[PDB]
Design a protein around this ligand. Structure first.
Ligand SMILES: Nc1ncnc2c1ncn2[C@@H]1O[C@H](COP(=O)(O)OP(=O)(O)O)[C@@H](O)[C@H]1O
Ligand SMILES: Nc1ncnc2c1ncn2[C@@H]1O[C@H](COP(=O)(O)OP(=O)(O)O)[C@@H](O)[C@H]1O
Ligand code: SF4
Ligand code: SF4
Ligand SMILES: [Mg+2]
Ligand SMILES: [Mg+2]
Lengths: 277, 277
């Protein structure tokens, strides 16, 4: 068995940083993990690979001729802790559907046998600002059974969490895609943890971890590393280890209860977020 | 003549706040303005209308039967300063293309004669995290001749600005869509203004205004108002008046020069952004 997990969230919220650090912690534990980048930014594996980014399946297929001329051994790349990494890519802006490369990538990986019995986890790092096309495919096509949403006390981040939850509800009749939890990537604001806990409770899930804002992340990323690799003794490394432990142990996978915009606004007002100075 | 402008940018960067405040300042000056919401969040007109949000063309068409059963006089709503407001809407998450409602809305507005000679400006408030489907339509179909990108020293915000610029370049052979400038919506970080000026120069454009981070925005928005209406004497009101003046006077509309990710990273490192504590 392997657990298929997808990390969703609005752009810039911390999906790739959180995913790569969580996965590094899992590898440090002895888990075998694959990361599948499903964001056109295509930098979802750079901290595992110590790289600028990674050439995408869409790019490699175009240079090879067709995706079928690609071999899995040429596409997947291993980095820190033996974590295997692949990037979907996507069309250039203004051309075709930004999510089209995700469909091509996931189907290629399945056909080519990337989902070897030995994997313990697959993480898809998925753009979440729209829930359509290839970005909806992990949910619509039952590819990621456990969705974790990175979010913060930002209204936009919570709105995205609600929209992703609506997509999960839409496809609940088929497959087994469920919301596994919210991950609060802190903006260093008062009561933020309480706010995301409250949002999670309203959606029917939980806040699986509160990730502090910590500049060690920037220092590690400037060096193309997870915090786990860059400074295993960092306080922030232990934060990602705690998140990884809780993901491993998590058994709550729900069909979420999307909320109204009135409920979101009440949450913000209640927890004095919009009133913090 | 009327100037057709589109405000693009990543989610949560400040498009709707900036657009509505800029437009309120234009109306305060005596300009006639229409705002067309092109973001599924569909709250791009609430501060002009003093409202929760606005019912969308997609919603109204579904209740009426077809979009052709709708009348312009039932769709457009006027708020502060006589500013006319409409929201496109979009499909629910997981269903169909998130941008489909933008195509329906803009075509409806054109067919129904919303672009009356008396308008001085139309502003489209467009989701910019992907540049495809209906979100690319204002560029692809030559609807917004002047694109202004709201951005900040956030790497994701600058990446979005570059991707939108790539979309402008893609469609430069036809129509007349051009990049008019970057608007820095400040994160209260050192040298941010210099950073966005540098990015603008690399793209071939300009930073048309640096909008400070100011909590009066939250206080006005809690009351469903632009700062312009809420407190015309606020320092931030004068900031939006300065932005509006510079938009009115702006004559630089370029085919931009998208940059590499290496150039973006160098910009961040140069201006010690990622190294600010
Ligand atoms: N917990 C954190 N502390 C400090 N910086 C963070 C943290 N999480 C993310 N970041 C920073 O935020 C930026 C965006 O994170 P990223 O993971 O790339 O977002 P996404 O993948 O959701 O677009 C990066 O510069 C990263 O260094
Ligand atoms: N200059 C500013 N100062 C303070 N808060 C701001 C400013 N600009 C935007 N905001 C806040 O940021 C949030 C997102 O702005 P919004 O315009 O809704 O973003 P977008 O439309 O790009 O998703 C809102 O809560 C708004 O109050
Ligand atoms: S939103 Fe991107 S193509 Fe449908
Ligand atoms: S990205 Fe949304 S449908 Fe193509
Ligand atoms: Mg990312
Ligand atoms: Mg908006």
């Amino acid at each position: 068995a392997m657990r298929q997990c997808a990390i969703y969230g609005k752009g810039g919220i911390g999906k790739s940083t959180t995913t790569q650090n969580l996965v590094a912690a899992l590898a440090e534990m002895g888990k075998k993990v694959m990361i599948v980048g499903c964001d056109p930014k295509a930098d979802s594996t750079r901290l595992i690979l110590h790289s600028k980014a990674q050439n995408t399946i869409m790019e490699m297929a175009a240079e090879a001729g067709t995706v079928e001329d690609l071999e899995l051994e040429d596409v997947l790349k291993a980095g820190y802790g033996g974590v295997k990494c692949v990037e979907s890519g996507g069309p250039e802006p203004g051309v075709g559907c930004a999510g089209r490369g995700v469909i091509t990538a996931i189907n290629f990986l399945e056909e080519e046998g990337a989902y070897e019995d030995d994997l313990d986890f697959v993480f898809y790092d998925v753009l979440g600002d729209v829930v359509c096309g290839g970005f909806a495919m992990p949910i619509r096509e039952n590819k990621a059974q456990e969705i974790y949403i990175v979010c913060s006390g930002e209204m936009m981040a919570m709105y995205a969490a609600n929209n992703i939850s609506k997509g999960i509800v839409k496809y609940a009749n088929s497959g087994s895609v469920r919301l596994g939890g919210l991950i609060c990537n802190s903006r260093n604001t008062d009561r933020e943890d309480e706010l995301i806990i409250a949002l999670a409770n309203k959606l029917g899930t939980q806040m699986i971890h509160f990730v502090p804002r910590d500049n060690v992340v920037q220092r590690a990323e400037i060096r193309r590393m997870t915090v786990i690799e860059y400074d295993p003794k960092a306080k922030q490394a232990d934060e990602y280890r705690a998140l990884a432990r809780k993901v491993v142990d998590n058994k709550l996978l729900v069909i979420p209860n999307p909320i109204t915009m009135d409920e979101l606004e009440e949450l913000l007002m209640e927890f004095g977020i919009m009133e913090v100075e």
